[PDB]
Amino acid sequence: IKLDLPINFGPAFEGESIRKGDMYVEMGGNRTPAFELVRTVSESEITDGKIEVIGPDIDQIPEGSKLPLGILVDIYGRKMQADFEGVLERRIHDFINYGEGLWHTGQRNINWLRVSKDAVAKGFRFKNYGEILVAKMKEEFPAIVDRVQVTIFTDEAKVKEYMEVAREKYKERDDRMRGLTDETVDTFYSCVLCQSFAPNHVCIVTPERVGLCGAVSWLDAKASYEINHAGPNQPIPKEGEIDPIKGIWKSVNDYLYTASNRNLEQVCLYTLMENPMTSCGCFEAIMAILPECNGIMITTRDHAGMTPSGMTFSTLAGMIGGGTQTPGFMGIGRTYIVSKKFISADGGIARIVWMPKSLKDFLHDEVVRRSVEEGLGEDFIDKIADETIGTTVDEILPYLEEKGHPALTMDPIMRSHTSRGH
Ligand code: SF4
Ligand SMILES: [S]
Ligand SMILES: [Zn+2]
């Protein structure tokens, strides 16, 4: 339908970024609680086109301030399913990034948004989030979406409340993923949704490796392909298995070559050290090699602090970004860290020597579960250094020594390291 924003809106603005100095509001990114959700609802419980804002609006908050956020998108459609919810929810990301002076990254309840001083000057107000979502949902998913309603929560209480509604739907999606492993499926999925940001980037999504945005599970990719054969996701048959440990299939290599416009020739699903997966612009975390540690550090998009690699998330994002292949450096989704297949060819989670404490917190129970499953002890999470120990190799290494971090005494990871050239 019709969309009449006071701000430009379209593909050309998607890659915009908004510096703190230009920011009018910010919500999410661990600065305030924030979530987004897409729900199948029945038709009698939905008003098509209705957008409400519950809580303070853009003109009722100091400039440069923070706000908690709940984006709730109720969909009704004759053909609509629960299985599809994760597919539409992903699109909230570019839908918003199309608006000039609107910025969004992350997923679920670690999403992050900013609105620019200019967008506000021009007229933007929270209602417009709703208008964009209503228009675009309808436009992109014609066969699936008959009716759309949007609620934008900015009241502290209501976000806390609807967070639970979301948490519940989230857990429910993850349950569908429980049974499925890489060995026990015969199809993987390619994703190219982000080639607007990196023209040659392709994600290869398997049941044990979520998309680097952490918002496209194997099931999501599958659902997407069923929703639209000409869509951003394609099926890749597992065939021509070259290396079971590294994770190289002749057929994955084949579809990767085509999808990356003859740019990438091989990818290894289970290693960081040779033909690793490339990155677009929305990865949640970056893994970087730490040669002196015989290990790997991780830092996250929303973590501003120094890291023992000597650079911050941004500076790291700088090198690994753009669909180029970078041995020793990889962009990943948060929950990948706790996959069984997490860099399994390099010794798995045992290699992680440093992480932001927030990440540890977010993944706590899984880390502990996986720890036990590889005989690293339940106390393994506490042997991984974080910023409260130090940000430099000089600080963290004696800690690793003292705590007896397993990485220190494994095989030289650096021998694993195949250059990208020749
Ligand atoms: S990060 Fe990867 S899986 Fe997620 S939307 Fe992008 S290309 Fe797809
Ligand atoms: S991206
Ligand atoms: Zn992306």
Coordinates of C-alpha atoms and ligand atoms in Angstrom, one line a residue:
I1 CA 0.0 0.0 0.0
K2 CA 0.8 3.7 0.2
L3 CA 3.8 4.9 2.4
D4 CA 4.3 8.7 2.9
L5 CA 7.3 9.3 5.1
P6 CA 8.8 12.7 6.0
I7 CA 12.3 11.1 5.3
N8 CA 13.8 9.5 2.2
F9 CA 13.3 5.8 2.1
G10 CA 14.8 3.2 -0.3
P11 CA 17.8 0.9 -1.0
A12 CA 20.3 3.7 -1.3
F13 CA 20.2 4.4 2.4
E14 CA 20.6 0.9 3.8
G15 CA 24.3 1.2 4.5
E16 CA 24.1 4.5 6.4
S17 CA 25.7 4.8 9.7
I18 CA 24.8 7.1 12.6
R19 CA 27.7 8.4 14.9
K20 CA 26.9 9.1 18.6
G21 CA 27.2 12.8 17.8
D22 CA 24.4 12.6 15.3
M23 CA 22.2 10.4 17.3
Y24 CA 18.8 11.7 18.6
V25 CA 17.8 8.5 20.3
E26 CA 19.3 5.1 20.7
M27 CA 17.5 2.1 21.8
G28 CA 18.8 -1.5 22.6
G29 CA 22.4 -2.5 22.1
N30 CA 22.7 -3.4 25.8
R31 CA 22.3 0.4 26.4
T32 CA 18.6 -0.2 27.2
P33 CA 16.3 -3.3 27.0
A34 CA 14.9 -3.7 23.5
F35 CA 13.3 -6.5 21.4
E36 CA 11.5 -7.1 18.1
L37 CA 8.9 -9.8 17.4
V38 CA 6.7 -11.1 14.6
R39 CA 3.6 -13.1 15.7
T40 CA 1.0 -15.0 13.8
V41 CA -2.4 -13.9 15.1
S42 CA -6.0 -14.8 14.1
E43 CA -8.0 -12.4 12.1
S44 CA -10.5 -11.4 14.8
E45 CA -7.7 -10.3 17.2
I46 CA -6.1 -7.9 14.6
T47 CA -6.8 -4.4 13.2
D48 CA -5.2 -4.1 9.8
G49 CA -3.1 -1.0 9.5
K50 CA -3.4 0.0 13.1
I51 CA -0.1 1.4 14.6
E52 CA 0.1 2.4 18.2
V53 CA 2.9 3.9 20.2
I54 CA 2.8 3.1 23.9
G55 CA 5.0 5.4 25.9
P56 CA 6.9 8.6 25.2
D57 CA 7.4 9.6 21.5
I58 CA 10.4 11.3 19.8
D59 CA 9.3 14.7 20.9
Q60 CA 9.0 13.8 24.6
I61 CA 12.5 12.8 25.4
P62 CA 15.7 14.8 25.7
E63 CA 17.8 14.9 22.5
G64 CA 20.7 12.4 22.5
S65 CA 18.9 10.2 25.1
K66 CA 18.2 6.5 25.4
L67 CA 14.9 4.6 25.4
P68 CA 13.8 1.0 25.8
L69 CA 12.1 -0.4 22.7
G70 CA 9.5 -3.1 21.8
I71 CA 8.7 -3.6 18.1
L72 CA 5.7 -5.9 18.0
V73 CA 4.5 -7.0 14.5
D74 CA 1.3 -9.0 14.5
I75 CA 0.7 -10.8 11.2
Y76 CA -2.6 -12.4 10.0
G77 CA -2.7 -14.2 6.7
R78 CA -4.7 -17.1 5.3
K79 CA -1.4 -18.8 4.3
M80 CA 0.6 -17.5 7.3
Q81 CA 2.3 -20.0 9.7
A82 CA 4.3 -19.9 12.9
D83 CA 7.2 -21.5 10.9
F84 CA 7.4 -18.3 8.8
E85 CA 7.6 -15.9 11.7
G86 CA 11.4 -15.9 11.9
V87 CA 11.6 -15.2 8.1
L88 CA 9.6 -11.9 8.4
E89 CA 11.2 -10.9 11.6
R90 CA 14.6 -10.9 9.9
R91 CA 13.3 -8.3 7.5
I92 CA 12.6 -5.8 10.1
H93 CA 16.3 -5.1 9.8
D94 CA 16.5 -3.8 6.2
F95 CA 13.0 -2.4 6.3
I96 CA 14.1 0.1 8.9
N97 CA 17.6 0.5 7.3
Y98 CA 15.8 1.8 4.2
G99 CA 14.7 4.9 6.0
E100 CA 17.3 7.7 5.9
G101 CA 18.4 8.5 9.4
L102 CA 17.0 5.2 10.7
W103 CA 19.6 2.6 11.8
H104 CA 19.1 -1.0 13.0
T105 CA 21.3 -4.0 13.7
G106 CA 21.1 -7.2 15.7
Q107 CA 18.2 -9.5 16.3
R108 CA 15.4 -10.5 18.7
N109 CA 16.3 -9.1 22.1
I110 CA 19.8 -7.8 21.2
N111 CA 18.6 -5.6 18.5
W112 CA 20.0 -2.0 18.5
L113 CA 18.5 1.1 16.9
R114 CA 19.5 4.7 16.4
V115 CA 17.5 7.6 15.0
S116 CA 19.5 10.6 13.6
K117 CA 19.1 14.3 14.5
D118 CA 18.3 15.0 10.9
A119 CA 15.5 12.4 10.6
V120 CA 13.9 14.0 13.6
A121 CA 14.4 17.5 12.2
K122 CA 12.6 16.4 9.0
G123 CA 9.6 15.0 10.9
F124 CA 10.3 11.4 11.9
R125 CA 8.2 10.0 14.7
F126 CA 7.7 6.5 16.1
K127 CA 4.5 6.0 14.2
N128 CA 6.7 5.9 11.1
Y129 CA 8.4 2.7 12.3
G130 CA 4.8 1.2 12.1
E131 CA 4.1 2.6 8.7
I132 CA 7.2 1.2 7.2
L133 CA 6.7 -2.2 8.7
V134 CA 3.1 -2.4 7.6
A135 CA 3.8 -1.3 4.0
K136 CA 6.9 -3.5 3.6
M137 CA 5.6 -6.6 5.2
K138 CA 2.6 -6.5 2.8
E139 CA 4.7 -5.7 -0.2
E140 CA 7.4 -8.4 0.3
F141 CA 5.2 -11.3 1.5
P142 CA 2.0 -10.9 -0.7
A143 CA 0.9 -14.5 -0.6
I144 CA 1.6 -14.9 3.1
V145 CA 0.6 -11.6 4.7
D146 CA -3.1 -10.4 4.5
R147 CA -3.1 -8.1 7.6
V148 CA -0.5 -6.3 9.6
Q149 CA -0.6 -4.4 12.9
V150 CA 2.3 -2.8 14.7
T151 CA 2.9 -1.7 18.2
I152 CA 6.0 0.3 19.3
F153 CA 6.6 0.1 23.0
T154 CA 8.8 2.8 24.7
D155 CA 7.3 2.7 28.2
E156 CA 9.8 1.0 30.6
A157 CA 7.2 -1.3 32.2
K158 CA 5.5 -2.5 28.9
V159 CA 8.9 -3.4 27.3
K160 CA 9.7 -5.4 30.4
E161 CA 6.3 -7.1 30.1
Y162 CA 6.2 -7.9 26.3
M163 CA 9.9 -9.0 26.5
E164 CA 8.5 -12.1 28.1
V165 CA 5.9 -12.6 25.3
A166 CA 8.9 -12.4 22.9
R167 CA 11.3 -14.6 25.0
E168 CA 8.5 -17.3 24.8
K169 CA 8.2 -17.2 21.0
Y170 CA 12.0 -17.2 20.8
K171 CA 12.4 -20.3 23.0
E172 CA 9.7 -22.0 20.9
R173 CA 11.6 -21.4 17.6
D174 CA 14.8 -22.8 19.2
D175 CA 12.9 -25.9 20.2
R176 CA 12.3 -26.7 16.5
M177 CA 16.1 -26.6 16.1
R178 CA 16.7 -29.1 18.9
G179 CA 16.7 -32.3 16.8
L180 CA 18.7 -31.2 13.8
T181 CA 22.4 -31.7 13.2
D182 CA 24.7 -31.3 10.2
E183 CA 25.2 -35.1 9.7
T184 CA 21.5 -35.7 10.0
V185 CA 20.3 -33.3 7.2
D186 CA 21.0 -33.7 3.5
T187 CA 20.4 -30.1 2.5
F188 CA 22.2 -26.8 3.5
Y189 CA 21.1 -23.3 2.4
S190 CA 22.8 -20.3 0.9
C191 CA 21.9 -16.8 1.8
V192 CA 22.6 -13.7 -0.2
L193 CA 20.3 -11.2 1.4
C194 CA 23.2 -8.9 2.4
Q195 CA 24.8 -8.6 -1.1
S196 CA 23.5 -5.1 -1.0
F197 CA 26.2 -4.4 1.5
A198 CA 28.8 -6.9 0.2
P199 CA 28.0 -7.9 -3.4
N200 CA 30.0 -11.1 -3.3
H201 CA 29.3 -12.3 0.2
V202 CA 27.4 -15.6 0.7
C203 CA 26.4 -17.2 4.0
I204 CA 26.3 -21.0 4.1
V205 CA 23.6 -21.9 6.7
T206 CA 23.7 -25.4 8.3
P207 CA 21.6 -26.6 11.3
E208 CA 24.7 -26.1 13.5
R209 CA 25.9 -22.8 12.0
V210 CA 23.4 -19.9 12.2
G211 CA 23.8 -17.1 9.7
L212 CA 26.4 -14.5 10.8
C213 CA 23.6 -12.1 11.6
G214 CA 22.4 -14.8 14.2
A215 CA 18.9 -14.3 12.8
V216 CA 18.7 -17.0 10.0
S217 CA 18.6 -20.5 11.4
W218 CA 18.6 -23.5 9.0
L219 CA 14.8 -23.7 9.5
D220 CA 14.5 -20.0 8.7
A221 CA 16.4 -20.4 5.5
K222 CA 14.3 -23.5 4.6
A223 CA 11.1 -21.6 5.3
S224 CA 12.3 -18.6 3.2
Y225 CA 13.0 -20.8 0.2
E226 CA 9.5 -22.5 0.5
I227 CA 8.0 -19.0 0.8
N228 CA 9.8 -17.8 -2.3
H229 CA 11.9 -20.0 -4.7
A230 CA 13.3 -16.8 -6.4
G231 CA 14.2 -15.5 -2.9
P232 CA 17.5 -14.8 -1.1
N233 CA 17.8 -18.5 0.1
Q234 CA 18.6 -21.5 -2.1
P235 CA 19.0 -25.2 -1.2
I236 CA 22.4 -26.8 -1.5
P237 CA 22.5 -30.6 -1.5
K238 CA 25.3 -32.1 0.7
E239 CA 27.3 -34.0 -1.9
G240 CA 31.0 -34.7 -2.9
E241 CA 32.2 -34.6 0.7
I242 CA 35.9 -33.6 0.4
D243 CA 36.8 -33.3 4.1
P244 CA 34.5 -34.2 7.0
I245 CA 36.6 -32.6 9.7
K246 CA 37.2 -29.2 8.0
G247 CA 33.7 -29.2 6.5
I248 CA 34.3 -29.1 2.7
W249 CA 31.8 -30.3 0.2
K250 CA 32.4 -30.2 -3.6
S251 CA 28.7 -29.2 -4.0
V252 CA 28.8 -26.4 -1.3
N253 CA 31.9 -25.1 -3.1
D254 CA 30.0 -25.2 -6.4
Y255 CA 27.0 -23.2 -5.2
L256 CA 29.3 -20.8 -3.4
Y257 CA 31.2 -20.1 -6.5
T258 CA 28.0 -19.2 -8.5
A259 CA 26.3 -17.2 -5.7
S260 CA 29.5 -15.2 -5.0
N261 CA 29.7 -14.2 -8.8
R262 CA 32.8 -16.4 -9.4
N263 CA 34.6 -14.9 -6.3
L264 CA 34.8 -17.5 -3.7
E265 CA 35.9 -21.1 -4.6
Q266 CA 35.9 -22.9 -1.3
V267 CA 34.6 -22.5 2.2
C268 CA 35.4 -24.6 5.3
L269 CA 32.4 -24.9 7.5
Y270 CA 34.3 -25.9 10.7
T271 CA 37.5 -23.9 10.6
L272 CA 38.7 -20.3 11.0
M273 CA 42.2 -21.1 9.7
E274 CA 41.7 -21.9 6.0
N275 CA 39.1 -20.7 3.5
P276 CA 36.8 -19.3 6.3
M277 CA 33.4 -18.0 5.6
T278 CA 33.3 -14.3 4.4
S279 CA 31.4 -11.5 6.2
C280 CA 28.9 -8.9 5.1
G281 CA 28.2 -6.0 7.5
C282 CA 25.9 -7.3 10.2
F283 CA 27.9 -10.0 12.0
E284 CA 27.2 -10.0 15.8
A285 CA 30.7 -11.0 16.8
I286 CA 34.3 -11.2 15.4
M287 CA 36.7 -14.0 16.1
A288 CA 40.4 -13.1 15.9
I289 CA 43.5 -15.3 16.1
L290 CA 45.9 -14.6 19.0
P291 CA 49.1 -16.3 18.0
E292 CA 50.9 -15.9 21.3
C293 CA 48.0 -17.4 23.2
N294 CA 47.6 -20.4 20.9
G295 CA 44.0 -19.3 21.0
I296 CA 41.2 -17.1 19.7
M297 CA 39.5 -13.9 21.1
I298 CA 35.9 -12.8 20.4
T299 CA 34.4 -9.4 20.6
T300 CA 30.8 -8.3 19.9
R301 CA 29.3 -5.4 17.9
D302 CA 27.9 -3.6 21.0
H303 CA 31.2 -3.9 23.0
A304 CA 33.2 -0.6 22.6
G305 CA 36.3 -1.7 24.7
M306 CA 39.9 -2.6 23.7
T307 CA 40.7 -6.2 22.9
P308 CA 44.0 -8.1 23.2
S309 CA 44.3 -8.2 19.4
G310 CA 45.0 -4.6 19.9
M311 CA 41.9 -3.3 18.2
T312 CA 38.2 -2.7 19.0
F313 CA 35.3 -4.4 17.3
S314 CA 35.1 -1.5 14.7
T315 CA 38.7 -1.7 13.8
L316 CA 38.5 -5.5 13.5
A317 CA 35.2 -5.1 11.5
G318 CA 37.3 -2.9 9.2
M319 CA 39.6 -5.7 8.1
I320 CA 37.3 -8.8 8.0
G321 CA 34.4 -6.9 6.3
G322 CA 33.2 -6.9 2.7
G323 CA 33.0 -10.4 1.4
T324 CA 36.7 -11.0 1.2
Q325 CA 38.3 -14.2 2.7
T326 CA 40.4 -13.6 5.8
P327 CA 42.2 -16.6 7.4
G328 CA 42.2 -16.3 11.2
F329 CA 39.4 -13.8 11.3
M330 CA 35.7 -14.6 11.0
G331 CA 32.4 -12.9 11.6
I332 CA 29.8 -15.0 13.3
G333 CA 26.4 -15.0 15.1
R334 CA 26.4 -15.1 18.9
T335 CA 24.8 -18.5 19.3
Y336 CA 27.4 -20.0 17.0
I337 CA 29.8 -20.0 19.9
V338 CA 27.8 -22.7 21.6
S339 CA 27.1 -24.9 18.6
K340 CA 28.7 -28.4 18.8
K341 CA 30.2 -27.7 15.4
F342 CA 31.7 -24.3 16.6
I343 CA 35.1 -24.2 14.8
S344 CA 35.2 -27.9 15.6
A345 CA 38.2 -28.5 13.3
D346 CA 40.3 -26.1 15.4
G347 CA 39.5 -27.6 18.8
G348 CA 36.2 -25.9 19.4
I349 CA 35.3 -23.7 22.3
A350 CA 38.5 -24.7 24.1
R351 CA 40.4 -22.2 21.9
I352 CA 38.5 -19.2 23.2
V353 CA 40.8 -17.2 25.5
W354 CA 39.0 -13.8 25.7
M355 CA 35.4 -12.5 25.5
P356 CA 33.4 -9.5 26.7
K357 CA 31.8 -10.4 30.1
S358 CA 28.4 -9.4 28.6
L359 CA 28.8 -12.2 26.0
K360 CA 29.7 -14.6 28.8
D361 CA 26.6 -13.5 30.6
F362 CA 24.3 -13.8 27.5
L363 CA 25.6 -17.4 26.7
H364 CA 26.3 -18.5 30.2
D365 CA 24.3 -21.7 30.6
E366 CA 25.1 -23.0 27.1
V367 CA 28.8 -22.3 27.6
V368 CA 28.6 -24.3 30.9
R369 CA 26.7 -27.1 29.1
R370 CA 29.1 -27.4 26.2
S371 CA 32.1 -27.1 28.6
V372 CA 30.9 -30.3 30.4
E373 CA 30.3 -32.1 27.0
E374 CA 33.9 -31.7 26.1
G375 CA 35.4 -32.4 29.5
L376 CA 36.7 -28.9 30.0
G377 CA 35.0 -28.7 33.5
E378 CA 31.9 -26.5 34.3
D379 CA 34.5 -23.9 35.6
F380 CA 35.8 -23.4 32.0
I381 CA 33.8 -20.2 31.5
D382 CA 35.9 -18.6 34.3
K383 CA 39.2 -19.6 32.7
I384 CA 38.3 -17.5 29.6
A385 CA 39.6 -14.0 30.2
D386 CA 37.4 -10.9 29.8
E387 CA 37.8 -7.2 30.2
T388 CA 37.6 -7.3 34.0
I389 CA 40.8 -9.3 33.8
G390 CA 42.5 -7.2 31.1
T391 CA 42.4 -5.9 27.6
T392 CA 46.0 -6.6 26.6
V393 CA 47.9 -9.9 26.0
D394 CA 50.2 -8.6 28.8
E395 CA 47.4 -8.6 31.3
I396 CA 45.4 -11.7 30.2
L397 CA 48.2 -14.2 29.6
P398 CA 49.4 -14.6 33.2
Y399 CA 45.7 -15.2 34.0
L400 CA 45.4 -17.9 31.4
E401 CA 48.6 -19.5 32.9
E402 CA 47.4 -19.4 36.5
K403 CA 43.9 -20.7 35.6
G404 CA 45.4 -23.4 33.4
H405 CA 43.4 -22.5 30.3
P406 CA 43.4 -25.6 28.0
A407 CA 44.3 -23.6 24.9
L408 CA 47.7 -22.9 26.2
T409 CA 48.7 -26.6 26.0
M410 CA 46.9 -27.7 22.8
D411 CA 48.5 -28.0 19.3
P412 CA 49.9 -24.9 17.6
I413 CA 46.7 -23.5 16.1
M414 CA 49.0 -21.3 13.9
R415 CA 50.2 -24.3 11.9
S416 CA 46.5 -24.7 10.7
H417 CA 46.7 -21.4 8.9
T418 CA 46.5 -21.6 5.1
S419 CA 47.0 -18.3 3.3
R420 CA 44.3 -17.0 1.0
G421 CA 46.6 -16.4 -2.1
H422 CA 48.2 -18.6 -4.8
Ligands
SF4_1 S1 24.0 -12.4 7.8 FE1 24.0 -14.1 6.2 S2 22.2 -15.4 6.8 FE2 21.9 -13.4 7.9 S3 20.7 -12.2 6.5 FE3 22.9 -11.9 5.9 S4 23.6 -13.2 4.1 FE4 21.7 -13.9 5.2
S2 S 25.1 -6.7 6.3
ZN3 ZN 24.5 -8.8 6.6

